Amino acid sequence: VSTSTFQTRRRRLKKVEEEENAATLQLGQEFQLKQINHQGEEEELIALNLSEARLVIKEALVERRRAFKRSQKKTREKELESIDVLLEQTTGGNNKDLKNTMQYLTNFSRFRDQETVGAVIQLLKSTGLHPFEVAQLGSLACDTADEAKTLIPSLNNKISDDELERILKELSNLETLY
């Protein structure tokens, strides 16, 4: 038995179209902008820049360790060892995917502190740009507004070159000095 979603659509006999997934912002049916949470409320897609993601997972495993000990009653290279220890505590251990993920995240995160990831999240989610771009803008370090618009091609006409270049400056300024 495998996992299901909040997307209920009834594909009766009519198999296909399964139209390709590209950054023409045409992601899956599953990674659509209009999502639905377990409380039925229409809620927007949640995309994470690897740092926003690093923090989320760390937070979740930290809180899990709490309940696991409760139910039992009756510097980056330094973060890697600290995280690899938390994984030994909460995770199934067979889950090697999370181990690599956490290592990659620790080594590639642009913003260390939660405070930092706060401002990143503000500055960006005010552009009206779709969660995918807003994440790739947070996770890909670009200098020219062309570097950005080339790598994130979906952006193309969505933002001024200058407006994007102004953001790229105040993004570089937020980067935690590793």
Partner: protein, 171 residues
């Protein structure tokens, strides 16, 4: 990229577990089944969020058998790669055919042909590397790749990617 997705999994619990540590075993079995998992529809289901509030609901007793079935509604962090996505990663393997790049849970492979012409294979090195006029790409090097396409393969997703286009390659 890297999403937070609301998901639900049906679990079929045997009567012997209809003790007070039921929710505890359900939340556990959920994590065993879902965490680590890799699907085509959702990608890599990496980490289940908010353990303390996993909604177990009421379990319907399956008639001829004893067991109860619950639809465990949860929320988790997923990684679903796409074609056109530009990603940063570390080289892992390197051969006369190209090089694999580790991007979180998954490996993205770069063909000798999906790189610029100047970058050429050097077998005569420990470990084997790719050499440009200016650059050197090997096992530890960090690279920015453009995903050309993905293949949903069992308990993983693998992809092909280029470093030929502008603003790609070594970092």
């Amino acid at each position: 990229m890297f999403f937070i997705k609301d998901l639900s999994l049906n679990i079929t619990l045997h009567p012997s577990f209809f003790g007070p540590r039921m929710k505890q075993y359900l939340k556990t079995k959920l994590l065993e089944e879902v965490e680590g998992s890799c699907t085509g529809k959702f990608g890599y289901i990496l980490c289940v969020l908010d353990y303390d509030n996993i909604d177990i609901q009421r379990g319907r007793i399956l008639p001829t058998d004893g067991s109860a079935e619950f639809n465990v509604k949860y929320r988790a962090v997923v990684f679903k790669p796409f074609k056109g996505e530009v990603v940063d990663g570390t080289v892992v393997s390197c051969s006369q055919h190209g090089f694999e790049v580790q991007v979180g849970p998954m490996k993205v492979f770069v063909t000798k042909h999906l790189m610029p012409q100047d970058l050429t294979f050097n077998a005569g090195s420990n470990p084997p590397s790719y050499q440009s006029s200016e650059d050197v790409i090997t096992i530890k090097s960090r690279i920015r790749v453009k995903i050309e396409g993905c293949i949903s393969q069992v308990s993983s997703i693998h992809a092909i990617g280029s470093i030929k286009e502008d603003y790609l390659g070594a970092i």
